[PDB]
Design a protein around this nucleic acid. Structure first.
Lengths: 56, 56, 54, 56
RNA sequence: CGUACGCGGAAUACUUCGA
RNA sequence: UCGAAGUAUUCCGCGUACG
RNA sequence: CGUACGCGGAAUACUUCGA
RNA sequence: UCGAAGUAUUCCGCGUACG
């Protein structure tokens, strides 16, 4: 029986997003300071050089 | 197993809302042109003049 | 204070309504004998496959 | 720019919630183990014992 | 005591896209 | 080397609410 | 043929807020 | 007389997508 404006629903999520966003930004930094990468994270990196060095 | 960006869920509800807004705008106008009002839309109006008159 | 439980429930109804909005709307096009360009293909493309089994 | 079935948006929130729900459940059991309560929880508790010992 | 949502504050791991 | 998102395993504090 | 979604485009009615 | 939001009956067109 509560009037829940769409605008008010939108809002709650925007928050849930920027929150969840700020968590990666921080988690990302934490992983750099440890020097950690996920299997995939490595594979992108390695390949990236391969390509661009192979360019000149 | 498709990924659903919150930024999208938002973008969607944003749409739902304007569509829902413009409806009213048209609808509200359509009413005025017939001169129709609701039982609720009456009390408020009547009560407003009465209040507004009871001021001057 | 907006519990998630509500966002859910609010959206539930909305879907179930847009459901009937179609279910009715679909049935309505049938009594006219109207189809979409897309519905023609999906229809005439379908029989060809069935008239070929027996 | 892909279509998003409202069933799936919902399907996401359901999940999301069932998480929130499950953290609180264990987080609650974590407190109970340390015997830690909240100011709110102190009243709620005490203010309940007096309405309990009296009214029966 | 038991149940229920809200919010603010932070870990750790994995995958997917894109230059 | 950058950028974007998604998924799981976690911890802390306060705050209404309901019998 | 049956079934599940998406999108954009409309009418009509009623209620709660707020000056 | 203005602004905002929420619920209801109902209608139309194209698009996929499934067996």
């Amino acid at each position: 029986s509560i009037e829940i404006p769409l605008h008010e629903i939108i809002r709650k999520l925007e928050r849930m997003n920027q929150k969840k966003q700020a968590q990666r930004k921080r988690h990302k930094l934490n992983r750099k300071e440890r020097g950690h990468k996920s299997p995939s994270e490595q594979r992108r990196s390695e390949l990236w050089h391969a390509r661009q060095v192979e360019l000149s």
